[PDB]
């Protein structure tokens, strides 16, 4: 069973019918073996006395009822006194004790030297004097104790002189609180408050510490600051024993009509370690700013902000945050404002990036970039759309070229379709206009000069085909179905000498099965590779009785009748193949069962003579607590040399490519425990590249967690060997898998 059912067994349940409304006017039912006195002035009940008055119940060996006619009061004061084995039970709290007193008019009840336990939730304790005031709103306890553990377990407890438990405020104010672990107290405070509910409340959060190897012992003591219903703020002083200073981590989540954001401004006033590493710097302060926003206003205006700005390149390799990893080459700084209706959308955005590298700090930025689409279907049998883009590229360095690019892409495609096929012709024009300035430096050094103004207009004709077959899989199970979807595209862009246009934003895109039929070799728009190809893929699926795709495989190839020339072919292929089936690419996905499930991929390339890239995975996932995943990612050294920069083909850290077997697992033990693993290996170098061993012990009143992680954390140029970094940390939280699996640098990514 889950822990929720385990804990509720020890929590008392309110089986009695719940009476709504005021219980003051409800009739009083008393059942006692003997009744002596002068009713209604004085009534004494002895022997198995049971009292009914709505939800409330009160049982005692002897009960005395006293009514006094208070002068000036229309209702006489009715007081109930209980002697011997007093057991007050209602729908909110259970009160036990030897002696009790009750005021029926004001619902005030007092119990001497007893123990309590509220119904429907965890919590208990014992107090010398227990009092209920304000219609059960205030549960005042004198010399009382409070703990959230179930009866019979003494993990932790709080003892205080005056415990006030405001049910409406969902707070448990404790006076002279002495927090105790078992019988041993550890923390004493004159005054303490506990949020015993779900209402958002300011005050310190529960601290969590961690020991690394970059900073030695660390400690987080967040102070949540509930500003308002739609804005909060956390202010965590983060301590680093090695760096000898506190870094102030300020968060600020908000929520408005424009969207729901999240700011952040970590800040270290001074750094001893950074002072040692760079003695020639004027100030050694380290700060991060992370602003992230995402909203839709009136279903037309879209605002996105994604902004990160660290002080120095070696920030993330030093301090670890949730807003960046040591595995980051650059920090992104993006704003965007959009206006999307049904048939139109103009989005003006800005993109600036901060490279963390000292090999080349030349970065390009779009400031601003305007993207305008405008669809207009049903132009007869055709469709249509016009894509326009204006963008201004400014470099960080002052010598590299700058440009202003305007683009217009008036598509028009005629779709045909039947029950079994669909051919989709599409013509398109690509009127790109440049204006490049600050060319003296680049033109002075290189041979192929850059023109100040460039026009580039190129037609693009495309003919997509497709057909679908079906078959009954009688040699599998009865009822299974199979398909076969042989697709076959033809594309044609003429050749335009694009060597006078600097490559501001164009990189080689990958070619899995889905990206074979794409009509762009380079992303972006500075390099539109001429093409004259035919693509042929075939996709087979296997449906079962309920028509649920249980399996699909795909293999496609491109056949270039003529080499894809941009006029600036600096790529470095292993051979001189130019026409013919240059690229192949597969893709599978087998859903073996409700729990298992396999995936795949491969992109053999004949110009490399070697399998370019190819992943995989075989995840078995019964639940978020019980899952075992394997995988594999490859990327041959030829691909690294022929796609990434020149020095990625020479550095020892980059030139081997990828070959990375890694297994993720997670499994409970004794239902109260848990273990989470991950271990990514780099089979080329036979060297680990990550790991983890998170362990959690969940219980009814507290759950402890102890992570660990040894990750690749940079490169040592002197010794030419990489540098690792442990990070064992301990978290406590009074009462967790998906926060362990997604912590390491290669976070778990579900494949089902």
């Amino acid at each position: 069973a889950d822990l929720a059912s385990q804990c509720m067994l020890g929590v008392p349940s309110y089986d009695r019918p719940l009476v709504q409304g005021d219980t003051n006017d409800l009739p009083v039912t008393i059942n006692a073996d003997h009744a002596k006195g002068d009713y209604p002035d004085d009534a004494v009940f002895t022997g198995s006395v049971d009292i009914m008055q709505g939800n409330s119940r009160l049982q005692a060996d002897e009960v005395q009822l006293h009514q006094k006619e208070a002068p000036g009061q229309p209702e006489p004061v009715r007081t109930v006194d209980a002697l011997g084995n007093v057991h007050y039970d209602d729908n909110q709290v259970i009160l036990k004790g030897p002696k009790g007193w009750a005021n029926l008019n004001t619902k005030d009840t007092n119990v001497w030297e007893g123990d309590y336990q509220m119904v429907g939730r965890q919590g208990r304790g014992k107090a010398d004097l227990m009092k209920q005031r304000g219609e059960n709103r205030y549960t005042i306890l004198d010399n009382g104790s409070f703990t959230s553990c179930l009866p019979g377990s003494d993990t932790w407890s709080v003892v205080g002189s005056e415990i006030i438990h405001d049910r409406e405020e969902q707070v448990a104010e404790i006076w002279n609180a002495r927090f105790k672990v078992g019988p041993v107290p550890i923390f004493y405070s004159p005054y303490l408050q506990l949020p015993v509910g779900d209402k958002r409340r300011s005050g310190f959060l529960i601290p969590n510490a961690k020991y690394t190897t970059t900073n030695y012992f660390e400690f987080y003591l967040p102070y949540y600051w509930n500003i308002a219903p739609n804005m909060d703020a956390t202010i965590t002083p983060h301590y680093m024993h090695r760096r000898g200073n506190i870094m102030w981590e300020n968060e600020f989540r908000y929520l408005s009509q424009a969207g729901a954001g999240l700011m952040e401004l970590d800040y270290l006033p001074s750094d001893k370690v950074y002072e040692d590493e760079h003695p020639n710097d004027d100030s050694s302060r380290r700060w991060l700013f992370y602003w992230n926003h995402s909203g839709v206003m009136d279903q037309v205006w879209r605002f996105n902000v994604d902004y990160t700005k660290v002080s120095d390149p070696s920030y993330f390799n030093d301090f670890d945050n949730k807003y960046g990893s040591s595995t980051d080459g650059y920090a992104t700084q993006k704003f965007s404002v959009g206006y999307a209706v049904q048939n139109f959308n103009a989005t003006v955005s800005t993109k600036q990036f901060q490279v963390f590298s000292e090999q080349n700090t030349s970065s390009y930025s779009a400031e601003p970039q305007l993207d305008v689409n405008y669809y207009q279907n049903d132009v007869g049998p055709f469709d249509t759309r016009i894509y326009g883009q204006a963008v201004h590229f400014v470099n960080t360095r002052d010598d590299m070229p700058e440009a202003t690019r305007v683009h217009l892409e008036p598509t028009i495609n005629l779709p045909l379709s039947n029950n079994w096929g669909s051919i989709n012709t599409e013509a398109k024009l690509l009127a790109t206009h440049y204006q490049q300035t600050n060319l003296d430096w680049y033109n002075s050094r290189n041979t192929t000069k850059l023109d100040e103004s460039v026009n580039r207009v190129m037609p693009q004709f495309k003919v997509d085909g497709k057909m679908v077959f079906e078959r009954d899989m009688e040699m599998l199970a009865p009822g299974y179905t199979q398909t076969l979807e042989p697709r076959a595209q033809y594309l044609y862009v003429p050749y335009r000498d694009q060597s006078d246009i600097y490559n501001y934003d164009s990189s080689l895109l990958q070619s899995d099965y889905s990206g074979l039929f794409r009509d762009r070799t380079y992303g972006g728009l500075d390099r539109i590779a001429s093409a004259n190809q035919v693509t042929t893929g075939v996709t087979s699926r296997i449906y079962d009785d309920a028509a649920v795709e249980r399996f699909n495989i795909s293999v496609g190839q491109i056949y270039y009748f003529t080499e894809s020339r941009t006029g600036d072919d600096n790529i470095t292929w292993e051979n001189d193949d130019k026409t013919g089936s240059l690229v192949w690419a597969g893709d599978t996905y087998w859903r073996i069962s409700e729990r298992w499930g396999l995936r795949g991929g491969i992109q053999y390339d004949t110009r490399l003579d070697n399998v370019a890239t190819s992943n995989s995975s075989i995840e078995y996932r019964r639940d978020e607590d019980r899952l075992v995943q394997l995988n594999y990612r490859y990327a041959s050294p030829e691909y690294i040399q022929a796609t990434l920069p020149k020095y990625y083909s020479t550095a020892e850290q980059y030139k081997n490519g990828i070959s990375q077997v890694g297994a993720v697992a997670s499994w409970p033990i004794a239902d109260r425990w848990s273990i989470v693993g991950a271990y990514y290996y780099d089979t080329n170098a036979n060297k680990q590249a990550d790991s983890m061993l998170g362990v959690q012990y969940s219980s009814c009143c507290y759950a402890i967690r102890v992570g660990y992680e040894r990750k690749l954390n940079g490169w040592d140029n002197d010794k030419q060997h990489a540098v690792y970094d442990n990070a064992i940390g301990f978290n406590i939280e009074l009462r967790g898998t998906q926060e362990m699996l997604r912590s390491n640098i290669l976070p778990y990514q579900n494949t089902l």
């Binding site: 779900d198 209402k199 409340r201 005050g203 804005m231 956390t234 929520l255």
Partner: peptide
């Protein structure tokens, strides 16, 4: 001690 929680629009 305090208590975090998902935000909501004010009443």
């Amino acid at each position: 001690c305090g208590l975090k929680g998902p935000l909501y629009f004010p009443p």
